Paper text:
N-Acyl homoserine lactonases (AHL-lactonases) have important functions in decreasing pathogenicity by degrading AHLs. Unlike most AHL-lactonases, AidH is proposed to be a member of the α/β-hydrolase fold family. AidH contains a substrate-binding tunnel between the core domain and the cap domain. Taken together, the present results reveal the catalytic mechanism of the metal-independent AHL-lactonase, which is a typical acid–base covalent catalysis.
Surprisingly, the mutant AidHE219G is not completely inactive and the activity of AidHY160G is significantly decreased. The biochemical data demonstrate that the Glu219→Gly mutation weakens the His-dependent solvent-assisted deprotonation and thus decreases the activity of AidH. Throughout the reaction, the carboxyl group of Glu219 forms a hydrogen bond to His248, giving it the correct conformation and the proper tautomeric equilibrium after it accepts the proton from Ser102.
Author numbering: 2 to 276
Write the structure that this text describes.
Amino acid sequence: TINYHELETSHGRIAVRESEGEGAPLLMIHGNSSSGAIFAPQLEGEIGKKWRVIAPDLPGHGKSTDAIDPDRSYSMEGYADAMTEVMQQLGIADAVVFGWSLGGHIGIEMIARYPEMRGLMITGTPPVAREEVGQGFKSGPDMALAGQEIFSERDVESYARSTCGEPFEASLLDIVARTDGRARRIMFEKFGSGTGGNQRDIVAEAQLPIAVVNGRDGPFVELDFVSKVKFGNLWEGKTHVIDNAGHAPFREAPAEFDAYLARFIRDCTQLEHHH
Ligand code: NI
């Protein structure tokens, strides 16, 4: 069973899903206009059966309330602050973190705020300085939606299909439609303005293991660019690509994605640590 509960935080009321796994904790952070519900394959599958998988909803997303203060909360660094507060409330200082897309950018911002993080895996996330956005992301019509406040019904469907990929389910529309659109506009503006830490430098200098796993056919991430990003400690020494998967390989190719995730968790939590 999945343990659903809600936390009162300084950002608002944050919905949290937890698997019943007794093993080391894994925080999974969803993407723009998604929710932790998207991680059903991990929560309910072999990953969540072994490890304590924690999948919250960002403020303005899913079953969480809108942010008490959108100006504070709706930014990569503001979300990192919220997730850090969530983990402190849960009493967990040393989670492995998996971040999907926006969630990966949030994970990068969490490195400074959550120093006992045992590793970070990013999927759908090119670490980029603000001036590198065109290099890290592919141009297209669904990309413009990332920072667009108001979604038409058609926008909801287009965004859901491109970002979540195969298979499409009606329930995805409900998640995307709920999202506080102010969060899209503000986060995107602040990202381009460099209001938080330079993500290129952060990942270059970070000493914890960082794993990079992407679908080969995602419409958003420039994989070549990602394969050239400098990481302080790149897990298994390369960026990884899953064939026949798009932006969301954790749902499009769960077995192959879970192989990477499980191995990364094992590596970050069950090997003898030496500096
Ligand atoms: Ni979706």
